[PDB]
Amino acid sequence: GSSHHHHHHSSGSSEGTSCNSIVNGCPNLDFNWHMDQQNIMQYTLDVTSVSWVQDNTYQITIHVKGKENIDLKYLWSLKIIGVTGPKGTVQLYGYNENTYLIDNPTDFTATFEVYATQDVNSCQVWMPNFQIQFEYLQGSAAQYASSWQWGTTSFDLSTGCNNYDNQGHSQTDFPGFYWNIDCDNNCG
Ligand SMILES: [Mg+2]
Ligand code: NA
Ligand code: NA
Numbered sequence: 001g002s003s004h005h006h007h008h009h010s011s012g013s014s015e016g017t018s019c020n021s022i023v024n025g026c027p028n029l030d031f032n033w034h035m036d037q038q039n040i041m042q043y044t045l046d047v048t049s050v051s052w053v054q055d056n057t058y059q060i061t062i063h064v065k066g067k068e069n070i071d072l073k074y075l076w077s078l079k080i081i082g083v084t085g086p087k088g089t090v091q092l093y094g095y096n097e098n099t100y101l102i103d104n105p106t107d108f109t110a111t112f113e114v115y116a117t118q119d120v121n122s123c124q125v126w127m128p129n130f131q132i133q134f135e136y137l138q139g140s141a142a143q144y145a146s147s148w149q150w151g152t153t154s155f156d157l158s159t160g161c162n163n164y165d166n167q168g169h170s171q172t173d174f175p176g177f178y179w180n181i182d183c184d185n186n187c188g
Contacts, residue, residue: 008053016051016059019183025126025176026161033169039151042067045159045174047127048109052183056117056125057085064132066106070150075105076138081156084128085114095139105134120178123187127177129160 006016035042049061077097080090090112091099102108116125136153137145161176180187 006051006059008051008059010054014054016053017183019050019052019058019179020185021179022047022050023124023178025120025178026164026170027175029161029164029168029170029172029175031170031173031175034171034173035157038155040155040157040173041070041150043106043157043173045132045157047177050179050183053113056115057113058116058179058183059111059113060127061109061111063109064107066150068106068150069104070106070136072103072105074136074141074144074148076135076141077133078102078105078108078135079133080110080112081131081133082158083112083114083130085112087112105136116179119181123180123184124178125181126161127159127179129158129162129172129176131156131158 007013008016032042043064043066046063047060048063051059053059075093077094078092079094080092083090090110091097092101092110093099114128116127118126120126133156134154137148138154157173159174159176160172163171165171
């Protein structure tokens with residue numbers, strides 16, 4: 001059968017609709033300032049794919065990269081929180097939760113669903129913002145504290161274009177993003 005479209009589970013299966021243009025909504029804000037002020041190592045986030053499922057639900061993939069490589073042994077837990085979607089929390093790593101879905105907390109991807117409803121214009125909607133909660137050097141990972149050299153060990157990194165100071169420093173750590181409604185690439 002066809003594999004042009006990514007298939008999704010359906011209330012059954014359905015054809016995903018891939019969005020062609022995934023736009024950083026605020027690439028001229030300074031995001032680094034907000035991590036630097038908290039002594040958090042800089043990270044970046046990109047949205048690398050968006051597929052419309054149905055309704056206003058999209059399956060998105062993110063890619064998160066730290067400035068320096070931090071070995072997995074330092075990590076205790078990693079989760080996406082505050083998600084506007086089917087699941088409000090997406091566990092990525094945690095011994096307590098038997099979850100091992102990444103192998104490098106400084107270079108990882110994650111795929112999850114969001115409800116994207118706030119219009120940019122008549123064709124495009126914003127990603128709803130979320131946070132990524134990192135806990136290093138807790139539990140069993142505390143034993144590696146003597147070689148830790150990357151600053152603050154437990155922190156949340158947030159997305160968005162809607163929170164910045166009067167000098168263009170973001171109060172978020174990562175940009176917000178937008179894409180076409182229903183991933184209809186012919187809108188407009
Ligand atoms: Mg698709
Ligand atoms: Na629909
Ligand atoms: Na956003």
